[PDB]
Design a protein around this ligand. Structure first.
Ligand SMILES: O=C(COc1ccc(Cl)cc1)N[C@H]1CC[C@H](NC(=O)COc2ccc(Cl)cc2)CC1
Lengths: 318, 318
């Protein structure tokens, strides 16, 4: 009641203001915690009433941060789980609730071992004396690299995503493990791409076409990799996979303050300039070769089957 | 007279039977020796009579081995040299002959230092820790590599041209110099092409389009390099440049016995099979990035200017 609405309002304002928490897996765990806390302390007669309640509570989290699709498609996965439980019990008050409890607990068991399974199958994609190029900062790709370097000796080009230099942290965290890393800017991507053998990047949101949004400037890396014919490896979990079509809804990119691009101390020329800072970008699925999830490697021509197995077509509007 | 026609007949039968001599530079030096010997021991009143005599003597060498264009376009270069001498003396018996003597001597002075100038400018195209892939056997490319390895440390993939494995000699002659070479077949070209940074090949004949014939299977290497966007380096002298257009005349490829592909001890299935062995292939000029001659690096969109500076348009039929 009071604590429920208090924590819901706190989560909504946390998604409205900034990125809280920092890890997307931690935000997914807090999303499952919010959904189990909202189903354990409420009352319903029909399962469709709970479906409408979860939809009404998810619309606010979607309108809080539209660029954060993880809470929205996790709400949609929990909606499909509750729909499948109502379907298997339809062909109902405490038994359905206990089934929802054990299913969301099984979802946390599956979600805690996602990066572990990605690091487990990391060995079948990296050979010795290999030139790797990445962009931005992501825990999945650096875990991939620090597991692949346990038995193999290779090189990683840590290209920074530079609206704000977050890839320096990835370069330092790899060089502490000894991956023989090299730091450059966004302007040397195609200049170094003639020596890059594979492209291993992360993403923020996998779309329904197999398209993906990620840290900005990676569409340029995908174009240079398609020019030089190198395969792209997308190490991405199964909760960044969303049924939002690219040109269907607006607010695709996330815009931040232009201070990180052009500072406030520039002068009188700030009045007559328009400085936009997209921290994301669009990558079409034909520029992608392989997706790496915790269940195995999948093609961009196979994301629709995971969409059918994880999502329901009457929930794509939410 | 007798010794002249004897040596002409010997050179004609040597070009009819096989490849004699083995080096193309040695054959060019013997071509200039044959042309100076045929002009020093004969009589003419007009320069056009000598032009028709050199044309009549060059038609036999062209019909001897049509795949050996070096003697034909060297005869054509000497024809343009004698035409320019007649032009500068037109705006004449011993002075024109002495001018032809000093011009062909200057042509030998320019021809002896071709591979030396290619090895001199070899340094501005090779960097350290580089993956090079070659095909066949050629003295220019191996001289390029053994000069480039005097100050740089890199790797060469010596892919064999395999109607008959001649690239093994190139691999041994490089591994005696320590280039850290690797030997494979023609079937692993696109399999290894995802780690190849540059393609450095030789050629047999540069055509008028900028197209080239070389040791066979290099069109496949050019297609794989165009797929993986690596630049092609053609280390080729300025006497393999000929005005013969690709689709203009017949007998482009040189066919040899099918014994090197399928042996005589195969059995009864040799009666009902057609085994063809082209030891050359066609490479279009859009699959080529850069030509390396002794005067400097030139584009495939610049071969026509060397054609205008070295050849005359009334001599392309010969
Ligand atoms: O050391 C590096 C550093 O790479 C970079 C560092 C920085 C930048 Cl900006 C770009 C690239 N790269 C090595 C990676 C192995 C390669 N190849 C080999 O060592 C051997 O190559 C072979 C050998 C055999 C075959 Cl069949 C194919 C390739 C040499 C260059």
């Amino acid at each position: 009641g009071s604590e429920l609405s208090e924590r819901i309002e706190s989560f909504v304002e946390t998604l409205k203001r900034g990125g809280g928490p920092r890890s997307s897996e931690e935000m997914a765990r807090e999303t499952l915690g919010l959904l189990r806390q909202i189903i354990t302390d409420h009352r319903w007669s029909n399962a469709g009433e709970l479906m409408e309640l979860i939809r009404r509570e998810g619309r606010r989290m979607t309108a809080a941060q539209p660029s954060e699709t993880t809470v929205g498609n996790m709400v949609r996965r929990v909606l499909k789980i509750i729909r499948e439980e109502y379907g298997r019990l339809h062909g109902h008050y405490a038994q359905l609730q206990s089934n929802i409890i054990e299913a969301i607990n099984e979802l946390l068991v599956e979600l805690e071992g996602t990066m572990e399974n990605i690091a487990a199958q990391a060995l079948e994609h990296i050979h010795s004396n290999e030139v790797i190029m990445t962009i931005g900062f992501s825990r999945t790709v650096e875990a991939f690299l620090k597991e692949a370097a346990r038995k193999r000796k290779f090189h990683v080009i840590v290209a920074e995503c530079a609206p704000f230099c977050q890839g320096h942290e990835m370069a330092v965290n790899l060089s502490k493990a000894g991956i023989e890393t090299t730091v450059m800017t966004d302007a040397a991507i195609f200049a170094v791409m003639s020596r890059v053998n594979k492209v291993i990047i992360g993403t923020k949101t996998i779309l329904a076409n197999g398209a993906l949004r990620a840290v900005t400037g990676t569409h340029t890396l995908a174009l240079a990799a398609k020019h030089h014919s190198t395969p792209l490896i997308v190490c991405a979990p199964m909760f960044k996979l969303s049924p939002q079509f690219p040109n269907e809804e607006d607010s695709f990119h996330k815009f931040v303050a232009p201070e990180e691009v052009l500072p406030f101390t520039e002068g009188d020329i700030l009045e007559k300039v328009s400085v936009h800072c997209p921290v994301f970008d669009y990558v079409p699925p034909e520029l992608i070769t392989l997706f790496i999830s915790n269940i195995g490697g999948n093609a961009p021509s196979y994301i629709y089957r995971l969409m059918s197995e994880l999502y329901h077509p009457d929930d794509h509007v939410l």
